[PDB]
Symmetry: D2
Subunit: 289 residues, 4 copies
């Protein structure tokens, strides 16, 4: 079981480049650094070479998250959008492989952030989503990549909200490299039980995100970490545990994650790194590995 | 300390009339039935008189909720909207008084649902909301009505997300009949601690909403009820404790509250009542009253 | 899944007869009333049939708890004592069957109270305990009785302190009608996790005791009832859930259970019954049944 | 706020010399090492000075725990025992002062381990304990030592089992250098709420002991660490937080603490050290320091 952090924790814009963070994160002690995959597409093969090398040199693994856009996704009833989504995913999957990344996670079956101004079609999105993910599974698999379908709360997704729904969705896809993904922030809202949600995912759990109920780093809040660690161990989980804290207001990140107030205690960068380091030590000790 | 339930618990649409629930809810054992304040505005004086007498004859109190619309919100940058908002409230409070209602709660400082498609101005909406609520406090006061400002999670309000922020707002208002209102559903997401949140509201807590993290009736989930009851008693809360369960998909209520899966276990009305009745017994036993 | 209560909740002495309690408890709404075997050996075959009749008439099931004495225990190093123990057990079991009782629980593998003034022989006591219980299993099974071995905290027993140890012991016994028994008060001290302890017992869980960490009626405290309820349902527990609260000081019970302060809140019999009725409602709602 | 550990963690006898641990514990990162006042009165003035200098050179603070014997306690009915007890405390206090220890804690009001072999007199022992502590308070105060009265579970003490009882005791003593002492292991059994208990102790909280419900190092279990940390902060606790784990079977320690099974995971010293070190980082991060 390896631990990582989403570099966006230190930024305010989703577009900020992660290159510099590879070494920073490694020095903080993390086994993994999770990055935003759409960025991977704007880099030349040489720049990607730098990155892959920077990671191996600093002894750290990269993992990526993907938030499909409304115009390029797999669940849309609009066939052109679905085609754009398929074309976009295959390209990204290819570039992700250049960085030796083997896990892609996020709302891959849909798009994020979701737009509720217009009515929503859950059954239809569910059905198209399954076809869509099934359609790119082999491609990802050939690049040795797992596609992890993240379960989100009602405000961020209307198709998969509980581990049970995520598991059903993964079984319909019927691919060995497609897995369920849970996030404590989301479970805290939707799940009847943390331990049960994790046990429900079981062998299908392929990626894991952590944070307190208001997205502070692990260890700051009332989350049932002890129960969480026990259940992760019950299902012999050896995948990644990525903390995804969002404690700074402002920018596209602040409005997209809806961080309306500062939750870092007005922390400077040194304090940010400290909380991360402490959260890491906390997660290793309470969760495992 | 008195217990009540939001009648829309039994409905799929906001447009369902509450009149018939007066006796139903009273016979289930509740002390209060909470009702939507917009519905009151659609009744004739005679129907209102009928309703007022029905509540009286059934030994049950009426409490009300208000969700200002984008067209009537006291915090809008557009002075015209603010004026409409003021007119809307005065009108509503008058009608609310015809039913002998002394408690109005909800996001009175803003609008709901909210639209995050346009940038948000927190400091601006905050300042405007304070003046706007201050501006209608006396009017409401002359009617014997307390205005309880509800603290909501980040996905439903961008100004007041915490008990601390709620207290600060009520203070800047500086009115005796303007209070803070907390809701376990919202607290569960935003607060560092349930107990500290309730203690932080203290003498200012004027209204209270309950439900599990996914909105089922109190007692079905992992909410820290023991801790919540101890804190409510610790601040000597003698206000209302209103369970606000939303376990049914479909309808306007389903889409607005984002109930994308059935959380009632396929409950018929009889099951619905039993759950409400058991949650009621639970709440009296664990929370007080 | 059925609910009961240990009648001594109302007494101060172990030597209090439970006959009158059959109707009182049935009328309070419990499906079961747990009684003390100590007494059962005293009543005549005639008085016994009267009790059996009273329970059938009030439609209530009886369950029994046994606290073997140090002069009559199956784990004794002394062979004379082990023989008295087996004789004491067959005799008791014969009488228990006259009351139509099918479940006996307690520290059947040892003796209670217990005496730590002398050195302890853990391995020896565990070993004889297995042989001893194995020695009487069939006799009990012929009578349709399950022997539930209760796991207790370190202050009350030195052999079986966890569900894992309880299960290990039940397996070394190798009898179908010998089961493991858990008690929330004891789990609260020794277990790493309530849910895991219950899952560890799984199919072997034959009887269950409930109470808050300090022995008040369930629902009065911080016990993880929601968690306990999920685990019980996960393992399809359909056995009995007996609350065993001890909130009164004085008498032998006060001394043996170490109730050094009142925890009833100066409750008179009527209050004691209200608390019992509420804890029952609570247990049925949160735990199931 | 400072952190420490009871050296007995690595031992099996209350009579193991602690001098060598001064350096080890300091190297592990602790601010404090808690010592047993067992030996102390047998060390020569020279030895004590060596120990004191060792603490200085290693920059660590010393604290002491005491367990009065049945023959030298202050609550005894026999006037001779109370006299020997007072003589014992003055002697111990003087030598503790030579090691520059300013905090003494334990069941100072009575004796440990308690013996329930014979009947118990709670009111009497209470009254005598109050006078006995009041009686040695000034002697301790001249040395600049605070006497912290430990609240223990029912199995270990019959007089003070609650934070409220301990606070009532300390008030009757009416001495500025006699405070209340809480221990999470003991609180886990007797208290209604961890936070309320800590809040109740308030400004009288002088010392604090930590461990999981079954006595493992802090962070290994389900203790409500977050709630506990918020409470200590609520009361501005700047005292010491001493983890007191007992995870090894065997010896006098093993039988007095009733450790009937290994809870260290068969840990060799290096692992014992890693666990302590990890519980330390954990405690500093969750509780503060
Ligand atoms: O949990 C979250 C935000 O709610 C992220 O994991 C997000 O889903 C990803 O960055 C894009 O899908
Ligand atoms: O908690 C909620 C729903 O999120 C309600 O109390 C709502 O805010 C009110 O009905 C309008 O303001
Ligand atoms: O839990 C308890 C008391 O600690 C009882 O169930 C007891 O064990 C039984 O009455 C005799 O074995
Ligand atoms: O809590 C404990 C063990 O139960 C210790 O602090 C003990 O009380 C002390 O060593 C003597 O009083
Ligand atoms: Mn996530
Ligand atoms: Mn609400
Ligand atoms: Mn029991
Ligand atoms: Mn202690």
């Amino acid at each position: 079981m390896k631990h990582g952090i989403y570099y966006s924790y230190w930024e305010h814009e989703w577009s900020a480049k992660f290159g510099p963070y590879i070494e920073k994160v490694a020095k903080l002690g993390f086994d993994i650094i999770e990055v935003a995959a759409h960025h991977i597409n704007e880099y030349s093969d040489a720049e990607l070479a730098t990155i892959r090398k920077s990671a191996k040199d600093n002894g750290i693994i990269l993992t990526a998250g993907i938030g499909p856009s409304k115009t390029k996704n797999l669940s849309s009833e609009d066939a052109a959008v679905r085609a754009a989504g398929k074309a976009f995913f295959e390209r990204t999957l290819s570039n992700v492989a250049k960085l030796d990344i083997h896990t892609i996670g996020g709302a891959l079956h849909s798009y994020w952030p979701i737009d509720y101004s217009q009515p929503v079609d859950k059954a239809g999105d569910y059905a198209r989503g399954v076809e869509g993910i099934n359609g790119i599974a082999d491609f990802a698999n050939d690049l040795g990549i797992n596609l992890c379908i993240e379960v989100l709360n009602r405000f961020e997704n209307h198709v998969l909200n509980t581990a049970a729904e995520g598991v059903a969705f993964v079984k319909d896809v019927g691919k060995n490299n497609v897995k369920v993904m849970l996030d404590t922030f989301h479970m805290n809202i939707e799940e009847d039980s943390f331990g049960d949600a994790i046990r429900t995912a079981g062998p299908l759990l392929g990626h894991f995100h952590t944070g307190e109920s208001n997205r502070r780093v692990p260890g700051k809040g009332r989350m049932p970490w002890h129960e969480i660690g026990l259940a992760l161990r019950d299902i012999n989980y050896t995948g990644a545990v990525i903390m995804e804290p969002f404690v700074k207001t402002g920018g596209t990140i602040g409005s997209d994650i809806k961080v309306w107030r500062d939750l870092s205690g007005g922390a400077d960068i040194a304090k940010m790194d400290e909380d991360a380091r402490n959260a890491l030590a906390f997660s290793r000790f309470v969760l495992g590995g």
